[PDB]
Amino acid sequence: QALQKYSTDLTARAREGKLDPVIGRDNEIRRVVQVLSRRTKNNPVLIGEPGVGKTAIVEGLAQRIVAGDVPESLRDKTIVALDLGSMVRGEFEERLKAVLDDIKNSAGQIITFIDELHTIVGNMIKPMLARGELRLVGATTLDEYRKHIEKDAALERRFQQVYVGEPSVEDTIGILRGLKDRYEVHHGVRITDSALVAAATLSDRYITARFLPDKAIDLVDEAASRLRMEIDKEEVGPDDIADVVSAWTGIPAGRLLEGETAKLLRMEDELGKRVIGQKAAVTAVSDAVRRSRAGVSDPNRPTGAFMFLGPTGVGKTELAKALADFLFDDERAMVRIDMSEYGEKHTVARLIGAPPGYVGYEAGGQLTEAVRRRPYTVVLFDEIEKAHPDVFDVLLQVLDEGRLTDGHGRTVDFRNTILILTSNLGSGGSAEQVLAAVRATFKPEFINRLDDVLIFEGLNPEELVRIVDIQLAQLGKRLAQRRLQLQVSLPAKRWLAQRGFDPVYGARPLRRLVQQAIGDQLAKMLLAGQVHDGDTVPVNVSPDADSL
Amino acid sequence: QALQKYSTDLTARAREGKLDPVIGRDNEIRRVVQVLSRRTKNNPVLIGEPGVGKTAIVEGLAQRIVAGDVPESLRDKTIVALDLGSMVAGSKYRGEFEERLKAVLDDIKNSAGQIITFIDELHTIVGAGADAGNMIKPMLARGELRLVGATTLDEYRKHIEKDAALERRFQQVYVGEPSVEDTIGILRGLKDRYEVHHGVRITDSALVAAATLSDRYITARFLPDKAIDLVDEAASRLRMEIDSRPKEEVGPDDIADVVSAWTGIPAGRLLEGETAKLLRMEDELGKRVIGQKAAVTAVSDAVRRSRAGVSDPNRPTGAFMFLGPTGVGKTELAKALADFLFDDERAMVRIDMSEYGEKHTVARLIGAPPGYVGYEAGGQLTEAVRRRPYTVVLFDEIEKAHPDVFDVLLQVLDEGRLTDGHGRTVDFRNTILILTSNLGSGGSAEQVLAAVRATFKPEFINRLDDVLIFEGLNPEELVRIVDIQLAQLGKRLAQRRLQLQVSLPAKRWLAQRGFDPVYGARPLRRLVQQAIGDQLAKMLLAGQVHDGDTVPVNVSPDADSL
Amino acid sequence: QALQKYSTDLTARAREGKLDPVIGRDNEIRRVVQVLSRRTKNNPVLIGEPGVGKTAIVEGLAQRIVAGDVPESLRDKTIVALDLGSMFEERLKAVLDDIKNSAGQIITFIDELHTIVNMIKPMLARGELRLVGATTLDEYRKHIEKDAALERRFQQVYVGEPSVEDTIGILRGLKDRYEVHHGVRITDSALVAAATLSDRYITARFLPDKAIDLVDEAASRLRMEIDSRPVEIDEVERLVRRLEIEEMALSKEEDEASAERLAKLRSELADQKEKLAELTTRWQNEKNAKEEVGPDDIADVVSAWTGIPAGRLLEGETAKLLRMEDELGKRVIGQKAAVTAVSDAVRRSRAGVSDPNRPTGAFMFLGPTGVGKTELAKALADFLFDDERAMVRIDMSEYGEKHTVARLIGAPPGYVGYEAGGQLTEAVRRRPYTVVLFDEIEKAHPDVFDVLLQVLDEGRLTDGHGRTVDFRNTILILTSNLGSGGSAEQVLAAVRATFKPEFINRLDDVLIFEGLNPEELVRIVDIQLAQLGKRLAQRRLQLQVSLPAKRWLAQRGFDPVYGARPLRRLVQQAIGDQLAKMLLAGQVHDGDTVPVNVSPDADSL
Ligand SMILES: Nc1ncnc2c1ncn2[C@@H]1O[C@H](COP(=O)(O)OP(=O)(O)OP(O)(O)=S)[C@@H](O)[C@H]1O
Ligand SMILES: Nc1ncnc2c1ncn2[C@@H]1O[C@H](COP(=O)(O)OP(=O)(O)OP(O)(O)=S)[C@@H](O)[C@H]1O
Ligand SMILES: Nc1ncnc2c1ncn2[C@@H]1O[C@H](COP(=O)(O)OP(=O)(O)OP(O)(O)=S)[C@@H](O)[C@H]1O
Ligand SMILES: Nc1ncnc2c1ncn2[C@@H]1O[C@H](COP(=O)(O)OP(=O)(O)OP(O)(O)=S)[C@@H](O)[C@H]1O
Numbered sequence A: 001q002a003l004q005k006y007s008t009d010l011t012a013r014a015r016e017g018k019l020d021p022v023i024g025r026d027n028e029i030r031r032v033v034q035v036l037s038r039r040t041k042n043n044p045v046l047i048g049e050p051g052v053g054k055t056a057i058v059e060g061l062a063q064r065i066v067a068g069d070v071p072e073s074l075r076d077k078t079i080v081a082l083d084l085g086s087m088v089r090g091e092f093e094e095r096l097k098a099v100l101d102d103i104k105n106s107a108g109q110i111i112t113f114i115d116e117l118h119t120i121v122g123n124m125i126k127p128m129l130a131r132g133e134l135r136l137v138g139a140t141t142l143d144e145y146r147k148h149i150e151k152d153a154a155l156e157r158r159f160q161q162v163y164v165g166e167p168s169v170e171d172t173i174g175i176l177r178g179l180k181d182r183y184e185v186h187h188g189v190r191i192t193d194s195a196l197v198a199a200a201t202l203s204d205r206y207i208t209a210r211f212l213p214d215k216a217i218d219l220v221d222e223a224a225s226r227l228r229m230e231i232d233k234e235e236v237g238p239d240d241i242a243d244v245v246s247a248w249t250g251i252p253a254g255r256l257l258e259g260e261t262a263k264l265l266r267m268e269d270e271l272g273k274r275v276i277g278q279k280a281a282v283t284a285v286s287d288a289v290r291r292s293r294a295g296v297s298d299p300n301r302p303t304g305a306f307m308f309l310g311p312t313g314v315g316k317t318e319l320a321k322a323l324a325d326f327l328f329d330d331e332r333a334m335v336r337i338d339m340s341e342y343g344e345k346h347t348v349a350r351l352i353g354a355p356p357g358y359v360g361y362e363a364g365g366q367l368t369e370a371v372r373r374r375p376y377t378v379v380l381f382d383e384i385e386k387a388h389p390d391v392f393d394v395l396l397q398v399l400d401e402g403r404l405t406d407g408h409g410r411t412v413d414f415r416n417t418i419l420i421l422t423s424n425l426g427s428g429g430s431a432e433q434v435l436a437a438v439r440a441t442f443k444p445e446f447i448n449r450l451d452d453v454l455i456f457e458g459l460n461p462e463e464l465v466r467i468v469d470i471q472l473a474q475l476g477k478r479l480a481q482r483r484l485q486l487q488v489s490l491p492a493k494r495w496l497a498q499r500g501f502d503p504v505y506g507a508r509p510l511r512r513l514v515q516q517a518i519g520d521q522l523a524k525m526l527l528a529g530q531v532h533d534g535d536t537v538p539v540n541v542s543p544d545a546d547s548l
Numbered sequence B: 001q002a003l004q005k006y007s008t009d010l011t012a013r014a015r016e017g018k019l020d021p022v023i024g025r026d027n028e029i030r031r032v033v034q035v036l037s038r039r040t041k042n043n044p045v046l047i048g049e050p051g052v053g054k055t056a057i058v059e060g061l062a063q064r065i066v067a068g069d070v071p072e073s074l075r076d077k078t079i080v081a082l083d084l085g086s087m088v089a090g091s092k093y094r095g096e097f098e099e100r101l102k103a104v105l106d107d108i109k110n111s112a113g114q115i116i117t118f119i120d121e122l123h124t125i126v127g128a129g130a131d132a133g134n135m136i137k138p139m140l141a142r143g144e145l146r147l148v149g150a151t152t153l154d155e156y157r158k159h160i161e162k163d164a165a166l167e168r169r170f171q172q173v174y175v176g177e178p179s180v181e182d183t184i185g186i187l188r189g190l191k192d193r194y195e196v197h198h199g200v201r202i203t204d205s206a207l208v209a210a211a212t213l214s215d216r217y218i219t220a221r222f223l224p225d226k227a228i229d230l231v232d233e234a235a236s237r238l239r240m241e242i243d244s245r246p247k248e249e250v251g252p253d254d255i256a257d258v259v260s261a262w263t264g265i266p267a268g269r270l271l272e273g274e275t276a277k278l279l280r281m282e283d284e285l286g287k288r289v290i291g292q293k294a295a296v297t298a299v300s301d302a303v304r305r306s307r308a309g310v311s312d313p314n315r316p317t318g319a320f321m322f323l324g325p326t327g328v329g330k331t332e333l334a335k336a337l338a339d340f341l342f343d344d345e346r347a348m349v350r351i352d353m354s355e356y357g358e359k360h361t362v363a364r365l366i367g368a369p370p371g372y373v374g375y376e377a378g379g380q381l382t383e384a385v386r387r388r389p390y391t392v393v394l395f396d397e398i399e400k401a402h403p404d405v406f407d408v409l410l411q412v413l414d415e416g417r418l419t420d421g422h423g424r425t426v427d428f429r430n431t432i433l434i435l436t437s438n439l440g441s442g443g444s445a446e447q448v449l450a451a452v453r454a455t456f457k458p459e460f461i462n463r464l465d466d467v468l469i470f471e472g473l474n475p476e477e478l479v480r481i482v483d484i485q486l487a488q489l490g491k492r493l494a495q496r497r498l499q500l501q502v503s504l505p506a507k508r509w510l511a512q513r514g515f516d517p518v519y520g521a522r523p524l525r526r527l528v529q530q531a532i533g534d535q536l537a538k539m540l541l542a543g544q545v546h547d548g549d550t551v552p553v554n555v556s557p558d559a560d561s562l
Numbered sequence C: 001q002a003l004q005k006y007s008t009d010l011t012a013r014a015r016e017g018k019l020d021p022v023i024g025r026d027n028e029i030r031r032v033v034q035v036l037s038r039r040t041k042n043n044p045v046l047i048g049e050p051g052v053g054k055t056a057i058v059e060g061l062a063q064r065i066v067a068g069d070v071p072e073s074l075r076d077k078t079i080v081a082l083d084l085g086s087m088f089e090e091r092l093k094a095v096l097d098d099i100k101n102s103a104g105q106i107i108t109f110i111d112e113l114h115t116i117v118n119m120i121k122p123m124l125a126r127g128e129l130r131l132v133g134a135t136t137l138d139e140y141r142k143h144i145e146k147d148a149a150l151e152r153r154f155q156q157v158y159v160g161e162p163s164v165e166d167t168i169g170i171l172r173g174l175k176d177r178y179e180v181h182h183g184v185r186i187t188d189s190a191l192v193a194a195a196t197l198s199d200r201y202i203t204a205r206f207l208p209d210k211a212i213d214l215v216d217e218a219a220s221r222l223r224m225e226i227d228s229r230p231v232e233i234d235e236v237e238r239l240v241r242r243l244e245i246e247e248m249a250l251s252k253e254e255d256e257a258s259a260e261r262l263a264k265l266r267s268e269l270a271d272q273k274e275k276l277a278e279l280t281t282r283w284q285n286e287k288n289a290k291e292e293v294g295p296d297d298i299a300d301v302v303s304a305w306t307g308i309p310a311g312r313l314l315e316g317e318t319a320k321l322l323r324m325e326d327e328l329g330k331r332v333i334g335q336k337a338a339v340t341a342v343s344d345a346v347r348r349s350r351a352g353v354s355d356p357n358r359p360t361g362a363f364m365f366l367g368p369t370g371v372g373k374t375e376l377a378k379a380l381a382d383f384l385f386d387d388e389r390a391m392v393r394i395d396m397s398e399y400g401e402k403h404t405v406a407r408l409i410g411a412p413p414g415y416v417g418y419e420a421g422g423q424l425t426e427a428v429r430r431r432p433y434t435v436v437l438f439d440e441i442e443k444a445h446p447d448v449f450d451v452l453l454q455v456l457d458e459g460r461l462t463d464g465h466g467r468t469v470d471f472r473n474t475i476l477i478l479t480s481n482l483g484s485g486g487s488a489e490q491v492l493a494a495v496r497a498t499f500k501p502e503f504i505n506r507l508d509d510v511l512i513f514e515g516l517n518p519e520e521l522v523r524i525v526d527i528q529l530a531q532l533g534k535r536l537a538q539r540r541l542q543l544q545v546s547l548p549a550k551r552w553l554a555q556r557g558f559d560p561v562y563g564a565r566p567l568r569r570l571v572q573q574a575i576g577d578q579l580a581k582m583l584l585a586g587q588v589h590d591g592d593t594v595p596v597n598v599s600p601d602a603d604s605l
C-alpha cells in the first residue's frame, strides 16, 4: 500500500464493476482455482496466443472472488497486476526488489499477476518463490514459453501450464452478443445478429493475422463508429461490415459473398480474359474443377490431375498462370519443375531429400518443400515424357492418396492442389497417332487415374489477332509515364505474324520482337522530338522493316 | 548488519518447525557432517539429478543441529541461506558489488567459526563478473566458510568444470535417487502434512499405488517428487469435487485416474463397462474386418492380457507379423484396431517400408550423430513415440527394405528400447508393433513359412509373437464388404440429405466385378467411385437430383445404371 | 488553467485565424475523428516520415474543429498540445492535474512522443486523456511495437506524402513568404517543375518538404548570382587566374622534364581564356536587350544534389549517349550483341522511359574466361564517373558461408562489430549512383541470393539497425563462368538449375559472351601497346613497333581456351624482359626511343 505505483488493483475496481462480465470460458477458472490450492507447484501461468482472453479469465476470477463462489481457502484475497513496461541499463532490479519487499511485508497470500513474464525470465526471485509468501499468475505464448521458460529456466518445477486455445465462431458469437448493449449506448444505432455473424465469419475467413475475441470486436466497433460519423441508413448490417473488411484488405466488397456458385459460374471467359482460344480446353478444365468441388469424391486426392499436350508456346503454361489467379488469388502460386534433370535412377530422390545428415537435407525436396508451405499451389511438369520411369511411383503415390513424407519426417498433404503435366508430344499426330503414342509411352494404368487428357489445338492463323491484340493493349500501358499514345495499323500488326510466329517456339519471341523494335527504335525520337502525349506516333511498314 | 539484508536464517527457520520431516538419507548426512568438520577445504556439494532430494538433506542437517544430534564440534552453528540475486541486483557502476561481497565475507569471518553458510544452486556463482565470484577462493581453500552447496549434474559440468581452480575447493557428495521402498517410506512420513492441508484422508494402499505407478509409466522424471506430485494432485482434485457440488478419501484408483489423465496411458484397475467392451471385442472389431477369424483372436487376446495384469511389464504389448496374399485386409485390420482402442484412425504411427530400399535411409528413424547436419531435430520414430507413448506402430510391407533395416527392430522388439542421436532412450513397452508383408502370396502354409525363414534370420523370427497367415477372401461373404463400402459412402453423403437404394442385383454385380483372385478386394473402392460417385456428380450439378432424393440404382446389362 | 504558460493553444489561434495552409488530408482527419469516436483502441498515432504533413494534419483538424463539423461528443474539444519546448518530475504533476480534473475537453497532442515512452501509462489505463501521437514507423517499431501493455490504446494512422496537384498549392501558400527575403520571382513554371521533377530523381527525402527546399535553395542561388558576376562567369575567371599563376612559376624552372608540363599548362590556359571571352561578350547582349526563377535552376539544384543527373537535355551530354556504343568500343572489343544491350538501357533511364521502381539496370553476362566480362563493367564505370576507382566491387567468393550474410548487412545491435556498419549497404546509403559488381556470383552461398531477390523489383533492403537504403538508381552486374565449354544449352541449363527461376525472372536480358577471334586480336594488341607506352612514359622512353611485329604478336598468342591474358603474358615476357635487361645495363637512358623488329623467332629490340 506504500509503493502502489508500479501495479494496479483488480478486486477494488471490481467493487465498482469497471470490468466486463466474462461469460464463456468457465472451465479455465476452475482449472486455475484448483491449481492455486495445492501445496507445491501451485501459482499457475496462462499460455496462449495474444488476444484470446487470458486477462479476461483473471478478471472473471477476481469477479467470482468479490461475489463469493470459491472455497474459503481462496476467499478473502486481493489480486494485483504488474506492468513490466513501467520499469524499463539497470535499476529494473532495484525497483523489482523494492516491490518484492512490499509483497513480502503483505504477510499473507495477496496474489499478484504478471503479464508477459518472459521479460523477467530470474535467479533473483526463486528464493522468494520457494518459501511460501507470494502467488503469481502469468501470461505468455507457447513459443515464448519454450524460449524464456525452457532453456535457461530451471524454475519450470514451480509453474503450472494452463491452456487457453481460442474460441470457436459460434462461441465468439455469443461473446459478441453479450458485449453488445455497451456499444448500443456508447455509439448507439442498432445491432443485428446478421451483422454480428457476418463480422465473425468474415474476420475468420479473410483476417488471418489476429485472433477471434478481439479481432471480431475490432471490426464491430470500427464499423459502428464509421456509421456514427456518416451522419455529418439507421441500422448496421452484413454489407455494412463487408465494406469495412474491403477497406481493410483491398479486395472489393462484391466478391466477399458466396464462394461456391459465385465462383463456379465465373469459370467462364474470366479465364479466357488471360487465356485465348482453346475453348474446349477451358470448358473441360472448368468441368473438372466444378464437379470435383461438389463434395462427393474421396476427400484424400488432388483437386485436379489433368494433363495437356500438343504444340509449344500456344499458351500451355498461360492457362495455369491464369487459373492460379482465379482460384488461389495469385499468379505467383504455380511451381514448375522440369522433368529433364530427372532422367537418371538416383536423381528421383532429389525432390524429397532423404536422410538427416547427408548432402541435401536442409535444402529440402524440390516437390515437397515448395508445398508444405503454401499448400495451395499449381504444380507443373515440363516434358514429363522425358522423366525417368521411377518418378511415376512418387506421382501415383501422390494422386492416389493425398499425403507424402519428406526427408525431415514431416507429413505434407496434396488434397487441395492441382497437378498439371505438359508435354511436347504430338509433332505430326493431329488426333490419331498422338493418343496411341501417349498410350504406349506412359504406363497404361497411370492414365486410368488422370482426368481429361485434352489436346491443345494449333493457333488458327487468323486467331493470332487476339493474342497480339492483348499484347498490344498491354504494351499500351508502357509509355503512359509520358502519356504518349500509340498507332495501330492492321497490316503492320499482321506483319508481325508471318515473321514472328515461328511454330517451333510457339509465340515466345513476339514480346522481345516488338518491345525492342518499337522502344529502342523510338529511343532516338523519345529523346530528340517527333512525339508528345497527344501523338499516336504513326508507325507503319517500310517495304523492308518497321520504320515510323 | 551485512549478512542480514543478503541472507536468511535457516536454523532459526527450523526452530519454528516450518520444515518438512526429512526421513532417511542417513549415509548422506553423515558424510556431509564428516566433510564439514575437516581442517581445511571443508566444502561439500550435493550433486544429483533434479528432484531427488538435494535440498532436503540440508534441511535435515538443520533440524538435526537444532535437536542437538551433531558431533562435538558442530553444536550451535546457525547455518545461513545466502543469496546472490539480492546482491547483484542494484549495481551499474565500478566496484559496487565488491563492497557488498566484502562486507559479507568480513561479517562471516569476524564472528568465530560458527556461521556455516549455504548457497543453493551455486552454479550461478561463476558469473557476477561484468574478477567476481572469485574473491571467495582464498577464504575457500582455508576452512573459513563452509559453503554447503547443491547443483545439478549437468549444470555442474557445464559451469564449474570450466574453472578447474575452483572445483578443487569442493568435495562432491553424490546423491542418488531412492528406490520404490524408500519412496514409500518417505510418503508414509509425509502423509500427515497433506492430510492436514487438504481436509481429506489418505490410504496406505493409495500411497503404495502412487509410488509404484509413478515408476512404471512416468519415465522422464525422478522418484521422491514424481511420486509426491500424484498424491498432491489427487488430494486437490478430490477437494474440488467435494466442494462446489451441493468414501470421502483418496483411494488406490484416484492415483490411476491421474496418471491416466496425463500421459494418456490407460493404467488402472479395469473400471466397469470397460470390461464389457473388452469382452465384446472379437465381434465389435469384426464390424470392420470380414473374415480372418484366426487373426483377430490373437490381437484381442493380447490386449486383454495386457490390461488384465498378466504380461511381462518390460517388453512390448505385442509384436505380431501377419502376412499372406494380396489385398486380403491386413493393413485394414491394423487400421481397424487403431480406430478401436483410440477413436482416431490416424492415431497410429505408420511408416512405409517400401521407401527404405537403400541402406542409408535408416537415419530417418534414428537421427544423426553429433556434429552432422540434421542433429538437433532428433529421429522421426523416436520423437513420434516419445510423445503419445501409447500408439500402434505399423510397418507396411517390410520386404523391400534391404536386409540392414531389420537389425534395428531386432532390439526394438524384445525390450522396447531405441536410442536417438542425443543418447536418449524411448520406451516401447506399451505399444503394439505390427509389421505386414507379402511373402508367399497364395502358397500353402509351408510354401510361405519357408520363404520367411530364407528372408529373415533366427535372431529376428525368434523375437516376435505368432506369425499369422491370412486366409483368402471367401467368395460368399463379399456382399458384406460391399455393404461396408456403401456405409462409408452414405456417411460421406450426409452433409446433404441423400440416401441410396442399392438393389440386390446391383450389389451382387458390384461384388462380382473387381475382386480377381490375384488382387483380392483391392480394385473395389476405385470401382465404386468411378461407377457411382462420378455418375452422381454429373447428375447433381446439372439438376434433376436435389437433396432428399433416395437415389435408386439399377443393374442394366452393361455397366451399372441409375 | 495552469497550462496556459507551459503549452501553446490552438483553440484560440484558430479563432484568431492564423494557421499553416492545410489542403487535402480530409479523409485522414475523418479517420482520426472516427477512431476518436470509439470505445477501445481510440486516440490514434500518426505514422510516417519527417516532412509528410502530419503537423499540418493536426493543424487542419484544429481549424475544422473551431469551424464545426463534428459529432455530439466533440463540443469544440479544445484540443491543446503539451509543449516539449517546456523542459523536473515535480512539475509534471502540476501539468497533468489540470487535464486530470477535466472531463476530457482539453485533450493533448504529444508531438514526437516516441521518446516519452510510469506517469502517463497509469493515467492512460483509466482513460482520461487522448494523447494524440505522431512519430515515424521505424522508431514506432523500436519503441512501442513490442510493448503490448500500451498497444491496446494506440491505433496507428498511416499517411502518405504525395499530393502533387496540391503540393503546388502549398508552394503557392508559401510562395509569398519566400519572395520577401530573396528579391526574386518564384514562377509557376518553377512550382510545377519542382513538383514534378525532384520526385522520382531525388529519392532520399520526401516531396512535401523536399519540393520546398528545392525552391528555397534555387531562390538563394539566384539571389547570390544577381550580384554582378553570376555562376559560370565566376568560375572560368577563378580558373584562368589560378592557371596563370601556375604558369608564371614554371618559366623559372631549370628543368627539361617540366618543359612538357609547361608546354601544356600554357595551352589549356590559352583554351580557357577564350571561353571566358565568349561568355563575357555574350553577357552584354543580355545586359542591354537572369532575374527570375525558372525550370533550369531547378535541374541545376537537382544535379548538385546526390550527384544524380536529372535535367531537360543538358546540352553537353547530348552527343555522348548517342555515341555510347561507339565510345565504349575504344576499350572493349567484340560482343556487339552485349554492347547493344548494355547501351540500350542507359538511354532508357536518361530518357525517362524505364520502370521507376527497379534498378536502372540489372542483368548478368557469363561465358568463357579472358573474354572481357570484367573489362566491360570497368569500361562502363570509367565513362560515367571519369575514374575507374568509383565502382563498388564485392567478391562473392568470400561469401561461401551462411553466417557471412551479416558481413554486407552489419551485425545486430549489442554485438561486437556494430558501429562498423555494413559493407554493401554502407556504400550505397551515402552517394547512391554507382555500379555494383558481383564478382563470381556462383561461388556464393545460395542464401545471399535471397537478398538480391529482395533488391529486385522492390528497390531496397534492411540492415542491422533496421533502416532501408534505396537501390533504384544504380546498375547491378553479375559475372560468372558456368559451363565454360558448352555451346548454349549446357550453360543455359546450368544457370537455370543453379539459380531460382524467380530470381532469373526479375533479371533483364541474360548475356552469353562468345570468345575472341584473330580479327579482333590486332585491335587488342594495339590497346596493350598503347597502355604500355603510356606506362613507360614516366621515364620518357617511347617505343616504336613495326607492323610485322604487331602481326607476329597477334598471331603468337591466340589459343581459344584462355582468352586474352596470354597476350599480356607474352607482351611482358617478350618485350619488358629484354627492355629491363638493358635499362639497368645502361645504354637505354632517359629521353630515348628504341625500335623493335621481327627476327626469325624472337623480335630483337
Ligand atoms: N469470455 C469473455 N468474456 C468477456 N470478454 C471477453 C471474453 N474473452 C475475451 N474477451 C474480450 O476480448 C478482448 C481480448 O482482451 P485480452 O483478454 O486482454 O486479450 P488477451 O488474450 O488477454 O491477450 P492480450 O492481453 O490482449 S496481449 C477483451 O476486450 C476482452 O474483454
Ligand atoms: N528424504 C526425504 N525426506 C522427506 N522429504 C523428501 C525427501 N526427499 C525428497 N523429499 C521431498 O521431495 C521434494 C524434493 O524437492 P527438493 O529436494 O526440495 O528439490 P531438489 O531435490 O533440490 O531438486 P531441485 O534441483 O532443487 S528442483 C520436496 O517436496 C521434499 O520435501
Ligand atoms: N475382411 C475385410 N473387411 C473389410 N474390408 C476388407 C477386407 N479385406 C479387404 N478389404 C478391403 O480391401 C481394400 C484393400 O485392402 P488392404 O488391407 O489395404 O490390402 P493389403 O492387406 O494392404 O494387401 P497389400 O499387399 O498391401 S495390396 C480396402 O478397401 C479394404 O476395405
Ligand atoms: N574485348 C576486350 N576488351 C578489352 N579488354 C579485353 C577484352 N578481352 C580481353 N581483354 C583483356 O584481357 C583481360 C581479361 O580481363 P577480364 O575481363 O577480367 O577476363 P574475364 O573475361 O573476366 O575472364 P574471367 O572469368 O573474369 S578470369 C584484361 O586484361 C582485359 O583488359
Ligand SMILES: Nc1ncnc2c1ncn2[C@@H]1O[C@H](COP(=O)(O)OP(=O)(O)O)[C@@H](O)[C@H]1O
Pocket (backbone or CB within 6 Å): A274, A275, A276, A277, A312, A313, A314, A315, A316, A317, A318, A467, A470, A506, A507, A508, A511
Ligand atoms: N491463348 C493465349 N492467351 C494469352 N497469351 C498466350 C496464349 N497462347 C500463347 N500466349 C503467349 O505466348 C507466350 C508463351 O507462353 P508459354 O506457353 O508460357 O511459353 P513457354 O512454353 O515458352 O513456357 C506468352 O507470352 C503467352 O502470353
Ligand SMILES: Nc1ncnc2c1ncn2[C@@H]1O[C@H](COP(=O)(O)OP(=O)(O)O)[C@@H](O)[C@H]1O
Pocket (backbone or CB within 6 Å): C020, C021, C022, C023, C024, C049, C050, C051, C052, C053, C054, C055, C056, C057, C166, C167, C169, C170, C171, C173, C208, C209
Ligand atoms: N498540406 C500542406 N501544404 C502546404 N504546407 C503545409 C501543408 N501541411 C503543412 N504545411 C506546412 O509546412 C510544414 C511542413 O512540415 P510539417 O508538416 O510541420 O512536418 P512535421 O510536423 O511532420 O515535422 C508544416 O509545419 C506547415 O507549416
